Design a protein around this nucleic acid. Structure first.
Lengths: 127, 148, 101, 204, 78, 79
RNA sequence: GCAGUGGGGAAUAUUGCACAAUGGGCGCAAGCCUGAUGCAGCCAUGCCGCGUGUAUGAAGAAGGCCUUCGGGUUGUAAAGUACUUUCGCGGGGAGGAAGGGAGCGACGAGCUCAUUGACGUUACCCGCGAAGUAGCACCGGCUAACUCCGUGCCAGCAGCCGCGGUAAUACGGAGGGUGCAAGCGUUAAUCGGAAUUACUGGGCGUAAAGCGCACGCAGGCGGUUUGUUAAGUCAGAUGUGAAAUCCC
């Protein structure tokens, strides 16, 4: 598709809306790299590689009483207009309550993770 | 104890059948200064009658702003009617930089430092609401962690 | 003012009188002036009495008269042939009237 | 500064401000208690904006300062940490001309402002002729060695004897010197000012 | 012609010359090549009247840089 | 300077025009913009033909319009 | 070209003094030239410590101001006196720069010494010393500051909303008050508020606004995997980063 990352993000923003147990999404090293921070931060239970012939990423979403584990989640860096932030440009999503995934040379990390490493990159999306 | 602040008072006049009946309105802000706020807007024939009645209503409808080091948690943009209000936390030594309608509500709120601005409609009655509404949508890490 | 100048001179063409609009009624004194700018506009004549003839030549200030639709300029009394008001005890700063001894 | 009838501002503010002969029973406020003009006898009808306005008024009148700097110092005190109201008086009370007054070198802030401008006042050795000078703690403010002869200060300091000084200060009539201990709190200052009313006004 | 003269910072009640090596064409207070020291006629601001920095000028001297009459006196004083 | 382009013409003798293209961001918007330029490179050996994407380097101005010369041919043909 | 004249215009100045200093041209040097410049004069045009005053001063008997006519206000008295201390007079007289010259030394380096002070005398310091003008705009709302009298949709006010037909605080006058404290008002000119072109900040069913439709060129965008190049992009170092400034 146009922007696979945005698709995945949306396909998850959708699954949570309908309170779905798990959601499929075409596999991809980059995608997996992302799903890695979502599970560590606590946005998702985890994930697993599924698919008889086609590689998929069965994502197991979790919920709680009141609000969903992931209220908001959207991509800020699209193919139409890429964005890059410096070590001091990394914005703290919701005073830190939430985090943002960035793609740097050191690898895919969050605001705090990237802030510690001391590097900046393309702001994948905010959650 | 609780502290009050008079935002503004309007004469207000309507053409009632038989002449002109005057009714004064008044915006009051009740707050202790450690995390609670209260907005009141009652009417009355006399100015003081409205002021008192307002303070009573302000104390009846209070909110609990989760202050953090004399500031707020995360930025918020409330949009009441045509009016609009934005808020953004700031380090110490900043000072409540905002409108009198918002500042008065922030000062009593306990907020020591904060950056804000009014967009769209700037009605003093619509801005105060948008202000107290944004103070409600405010959340802390414990809330976002517990609710999750 | 064309050149966006504060003031502009001009020779009067005719010193006639005009009547206010609907809400008013009087004989306001005006005069067509041919500013050096190359325009012939009408200016109001402040004061209870003036001494402007055909070859008056007076400096124009710039002010619209709510009463006279068109008169968007006022005459500066106290300059050129435009003699300042006489016995003006109040508005001396305007109309140009020296303070009596 | 305003520079004019000060004995009228007192009544106008309703409170008796100490401009000069506020001690003597000559102070108009003691003889007649009401603002200047002809409408000083009629019953005044103040409003919300009125109390706040007339509030900061007397505040700025006491120290006798312009509305600009008075507003500037407000922004500053409101910027730094701590209660604004408290910080406010702190800065204004830090003014050199003001300090000199509290020290007793001058009969009033007006006269003090004059003494400063006349280079008749020094700070930590070096002389300072700026009334808007912010006096910090541990700073010594004494009279000029050459000004130690002028009868004006000779009579001022003479009366200073036996007279107590503020807790945030400490003068020495003998050496005609003085020290600015620390920043005075609202508790130390007993001014007829409601720091909470002056702040609301600037809020608008 | 590269010359080494004094650059007057001259100000109302503030006479300070900057012995600098610059082209003769350039103005007295124009763009200079490089400062080698300073000069205080009254020597009131600081106790150190002048700081020639011999080694520095010692380079221009021979490179084609000529020193004026006045500056030469200060330089010679080292 | 080495520039990469295409041989859009081989009409002249010992003279071939190379259409070099580049991508630069807009000074205001910032979005990438396409811009090309025709350069008359020298080719004494008349080796390069139309459709050849060769490299261009700065050399002694053979003429007023020619100040570049053929260095190496990247590919074979892409009309 | 400098000063200046006349004309124009709403309108902008001494046809003044002088070279010692700094700097520049020529000469080995002596030295010469230099209204470049250094100053003074005229005009508050502006800014800084004092426009119509500053400080002092009688439970306050006069005058100006206001007034619900009870009162209140201006409170050096509205008299005087002293003042920050102006102005003015006398004396000294700055550089915030020292040589030119002369003596020693090879009139070279260096050292030493003398003359010349303001610019062919200002500033500042010291001494003496008289209190020594004052007015305009405005007071319905925005604009901070009140009524009486006269007049009466009458005369007049007005940037906008308006006001005046016998009680008008917006007309004219008077008492009083506010502002300016020669500034303040006023006139003219430049910037933003306007997220009302909106990249950050926007809209198009009915408020201004989608092409009548189809199709199609350029262009924009475009599934997946691998390799080379790597031009774009990104990174390190280095050169320039005109100077000045923006920012601190």
């Amino acid at each position: 598709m146009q922007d696979p990352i945005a698709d995945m993000l949306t396909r998850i923003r959708n699954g949570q809306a309908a309170n779905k147990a798990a959601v499929t999404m075409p596999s991809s090293k980059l995608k997996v790299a992302i799903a890695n921070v979502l599970k560590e931060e606590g946005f998702i239970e985890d994930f697993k590689v599924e698919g008889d012939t086609k590689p998929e990423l069965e994502l197991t979403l979790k919920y709680f009483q009141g609000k969903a584990v992931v209220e908001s989640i959207q991509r800020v860096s699209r193919p139409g207009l890429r964005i890059y932030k410096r070590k001091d440009e990394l914005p703290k999503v919701m005073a830190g309550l939430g985090i943002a995934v960035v793609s740097t040379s050191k690898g895919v990390m969050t605001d705090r993770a990237a802030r510690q490493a001391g590097l900046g990159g393309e702001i994948i999306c905010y959650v | 104890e609780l502290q009050e602040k008079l935002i503004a008072v309007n004469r207000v006049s309507k053409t009632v059948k038989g002449g002109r009946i005057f009714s004064f309105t008044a915006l009051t802000v009740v707050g202790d200064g450690n995390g609670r706020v209260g907005f009141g807007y009652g009417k009355a024939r006399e100015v003081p009658a409205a002021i008192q009645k307002a303070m009573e209503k302000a104390r009846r409808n209070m909110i609990n702003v989760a202050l953090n080091n004399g500031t707020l948690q995360h930025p918020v943009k409330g949009v009441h009617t045509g009016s609009r209000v934005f808020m953004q936390p700031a380090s110490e030594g900043t000072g409540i930089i905002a409108g009198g309608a918002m500042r008065a509500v922030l000062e009593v709120a306990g907020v020591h430092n904060v950056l804000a601005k009014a967009y769209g409609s700037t009605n003093p009655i619509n801005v105060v609401r948008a202000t107290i509404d944004g103070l409600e949508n405010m959340n802390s890490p414990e809330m976002v962690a517990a609710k999750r | 003012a064309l050149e966006a100048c504060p003031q502009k001179r001009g020779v009067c063409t005719r010193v006639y009188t005009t009547t206010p609009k609907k809400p008013n009624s009087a004989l306001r004194k005006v005069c067509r002036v041919r500013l050096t700018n190359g325009f012939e506009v009408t200016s109001y004549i402040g004061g209870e009495g003036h001494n402007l003839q055909e070859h008056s030549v007076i400096l124009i200030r710039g002010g619209r008269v709510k009463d006279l639709p068109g008169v968007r300029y006022h005459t500066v009394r106290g300059a050129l042939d435009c003699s300042g008001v006489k016995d003006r005890k109040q508005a001396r700063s305007k109309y140009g009237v020296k303070r009596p001894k | 500064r305003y520079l004019g009838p000060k004995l009228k501002l007192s009544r106008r503010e309703g409170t008796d401000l100490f401009l000069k002969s506020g001690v003597r029973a000559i102070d108009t406020k003691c003889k007649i208690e009401q603002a200047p003009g002809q409408h000083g006898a009629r019953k005044p009808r103040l409003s919300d904006y009125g109390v706040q306005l007339r509030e900061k008024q007397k505040v700025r009148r006491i120290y006798g300062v312009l509305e600009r700097q008075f507003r500037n110092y407000y922004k500053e005190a409101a910027r730094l940490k701590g209660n604004t109201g408290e910080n406010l008086l702190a800065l204004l009370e830090g003014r050199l001309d003001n300090v000199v007054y509290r020290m007793g070198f001058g009969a009033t802030r007006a006269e003090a402002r004059q003494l400063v401008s006349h280079k008749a006042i020094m700070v930590n050795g070096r002389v300072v002729n700026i009334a808007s000078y912010q006096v910090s703690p541990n700073d010594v403010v004494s009279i000029r060695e050459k000004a130690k002869k002028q009868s004006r200060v000779k009579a001022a300091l003479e009366l200073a004897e036996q007279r107590e000084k503020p807790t945030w200060l400490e003068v020495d009539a003998g050496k005609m010197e003085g020290t600015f201990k620390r920043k005075p709190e609202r508790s130390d200052l007993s001014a007829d000012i409601n720091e909470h009313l002056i702040v609301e006004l600037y809020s608008k | 012609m590269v010359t080494i003269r004094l650059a007057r910072h001259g100000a109302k009640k503030r006479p300070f010359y900057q012995v600098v090596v610059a082209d003769s064409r350039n103005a007295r207070n124009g763009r200079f090549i490089e400062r080698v020291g300073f000069f205080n006629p009254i020597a009131s601001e600081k106790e150190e009247g002048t700081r020639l920095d011999l080694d520095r000028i010692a380079h221009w001297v021979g490179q084609g840089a000529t020193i004026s009459d006045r500056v030469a006196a200060l330089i010679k004083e080292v | 300077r080495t520039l990469q382009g295409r041989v859009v013409s081989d009409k002249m003798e010992k003279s071939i025009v190379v259409a070099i293209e580049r991508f630069v961001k807009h000074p205001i918007y910032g979005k990438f913009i396409k811009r090309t330029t025709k350069l008359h490179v020298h080719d004494e050996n008349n080796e390069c033909g139309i459709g050849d994407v060769v490299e261009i380097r700065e050399c002694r101005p053979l003429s007023k319009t020619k100040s570049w010369t053929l260095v190496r041919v990247v590919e074979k043909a892409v009309l």
